[PDB]
Ligand binder design. Sequence first.
Ligand SMILES: C[C@@H](NC(=O)c1ncnc(N)c1Cl)c1ncc(C(=O)Nc2cc(C(F)(F)F)c(Cl)cn2)s1
Ligand SMILES: C[C@@H](NC(=O)c1ncnc(N)c1Cl)c1ncc(C(=O)Nc2cc(C(F)(F)F)c(Cl)cn2)s1
Lengths: 263, 263
Amino acid sequence: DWEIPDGQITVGQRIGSGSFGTVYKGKWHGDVAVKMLNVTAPTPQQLQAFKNEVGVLRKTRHVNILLFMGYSTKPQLAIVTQWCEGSSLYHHLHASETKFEMKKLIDIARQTARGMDYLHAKSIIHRDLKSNNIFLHEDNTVKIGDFGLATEQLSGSILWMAPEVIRMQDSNPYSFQSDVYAFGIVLYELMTGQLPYSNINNRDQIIEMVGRGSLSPDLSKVRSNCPKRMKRLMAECLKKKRDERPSFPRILAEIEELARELS
Amino acid sequence: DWEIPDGQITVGQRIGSGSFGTVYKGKWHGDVAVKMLNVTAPTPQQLQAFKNEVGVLRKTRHVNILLFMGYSTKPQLAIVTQWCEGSSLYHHLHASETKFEMKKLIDIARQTARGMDYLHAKSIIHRDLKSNNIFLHEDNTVKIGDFGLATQLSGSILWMAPEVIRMQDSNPYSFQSDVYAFGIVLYELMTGQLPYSNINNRDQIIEMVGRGSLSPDLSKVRSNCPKRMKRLMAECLKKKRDERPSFPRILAEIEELARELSG
Ligand SMILES: C[C@@H](NC(=O)c1ncnc(N)c1Cl)c1ncc(C(=O)Nc2cc(C(F)(F)F)c(Cl)cn2)s1
Ligand SMILES: C[C@@H](NC(=O)c1ncnc(N)c1Cl)c1ncc(C(=O)Nc2cc(C(F)(F)F)c(Cl)cn2)s1
C-alpha cells in the first residue's frame, strides 16, 4: 500500500499546469514531485485514469524509469514521484541546442532503450514515447515517464452503432511496435539534431502523409560521425509496417554493443 | 509479483559476498546486481531470511534507498537490485585520500536522513546502519542498504547503541538504535575519523560503551563544523533511547542547515 496520508507532503513551487492536473515540487522525505489532479470530485473517467496511471507506475522498478513513490486521495488525487534536476531531451536537442558528443548520444539512446525494454518486459506500452518525455536527470541519468497533459460508450450504444462505427471503436493501434516507431523518431532527433519533417509547414500534411506511408523522415540528415548501425537501426524502427519493426530486446542489444566499441 | 524467471539474468563477474549469498554484477535490461544464495537446498531459516529481506525491499521506493528490482527462486534464491558505481562512505572517509568539503558532507548527511526517515515512515528498521552500508552512487547520490561487501571489519560494533549492547532478543533494535547509528555516521563525517580511534583493543569499546562510560570524543570535530551539527550529533548519541530525537526532527534541522549554505 503506497498511499500517502494527507498531511505529510509539503506542496511547494508550481512546475506546470495541464488539462489533467497541476504539478508542484513537494517535500516528503526529501525532494519529490507531485501531480495534483485538479479534481475535488473526480469523474469516473478521471478516477479511472488515476487508477490506471498509478497501477502502471506500481509495476516499474528500474534505474531508467521515473521512480514512483506514492499516491494520495485526500483532499486531492495526487501522484508522488522522485524529483529530478535537469531538462528534457526535447529541451536539450530542440530548445537549448546543446551539443552532445557521439559517445553521450549513444549513451542517452542506450539508457532510453533500457527503460523501454523494461516496460515491454513488464507488458507496459508507453503509448506516448517522445523526446519531451525523456528527462535527463542531472544531465546524465535518463528518466522515462509520461509528463502528459490530455490523458461505456461501447455498451449502452452498441445495438444502434453501424458496422463502420465499430471499425474505429475496437482497434487499439498502440502496441509494442508503436513504441518502437516512437523510439525510432527519438533516434532521429539524437542523430540529426532536428525534428522530423522540418521542411513541412503545417501539421495537416504531416498527419495524413505519414499515416499513408507517403512521408518518412529524411535519413540523410544524420551526422557524419553517426555509426552505420545507428542509421540502419533507425530505419528498421521507422518501417511503415508494424511487423517489420524490431523489438527492444534486439534493439538494446545492438545499442549496448555499439556503446562498448566507443571507448 | 516481482519474481524474475530463470534465464533472463546474465550473471557476470563476482564482486563480493554480503548478507547471505554472494553478489555478482548481472545483465537484466541494463546493469544490475544479484545476490544469489549459493545453497542448492536452503534451510527454512535461510528461506525465511530471504522472504524477510524481499518483504522489506518491496516496501521501499525512495531515491536514497537501494532500488529493489526483483527476486528469483529457480535454481537459487536471489535478490536483484540496481547496479551503482562508486564506493561506500566508509571507503571515502577512512580509506580514500580525498577530503570532502563541508557542503558535500552536509549533503551526504541530508540524503542519509532522507533515506532513513523514509524507512522509519514505512515502519522499517535498518538494524545495521553504518558508513559501510552507505554507498555513494556516482560519488554523489547516497544509497542506503544492507550490503556486506560493496567495494574482516572488526569495527562493526561502533554503530551499535548502548542498549543494543545489553542484548535481550529482537527488542534492542528500534528506531532509537538506528538514530544512534546515524549519530556515529555524523561523527565520521564531521571528524574524518572513526569513533574511539584512540582505543587499543575492542575489549573496552564493547563493555565501556554498553555501560555508559564511553562516548565518542566530540572535540574531534572539524573547526568549520557548524554548531548545529555538533549539538544534533550529541543528542543522537545519548545513552538513553528516549532522549534521542527522531529522524523527522533530525532531517528537519539538516535540511534547514543545508538551505543556509546553498542559498
Ligand atoms: C509529479 C510528476 N513528476 C514530474 O513532473 C517531475 N519528476 C521529476 N523531475 C522533474 N523535474 C519533474 Cl517536473 C509526475 N507524476 C507522474 C508522472 C509519470 O510520468 N507517470 C507515468 C509514467 C509512465 C511510464 F511508465 F512510462 F514511466 C507511464 Cl506509461 C504513465 N504515466 S510524472
Ligand atoms: C544484490 C545486492 N546488490 C549489491 O550488492 C550492489 N548494489 C548496487 N551496487 C553495488 N556495487 C552492489 Cl555490490 C543486494 N541485494 C539486497 C541488498 C540490500 O541492501 N537489502 C536490504 C536493504 C535494506 C534497506 F531497507 F535499508 F535498504 C535493509 Cl533494512 C535490509 N536489506 S543489496
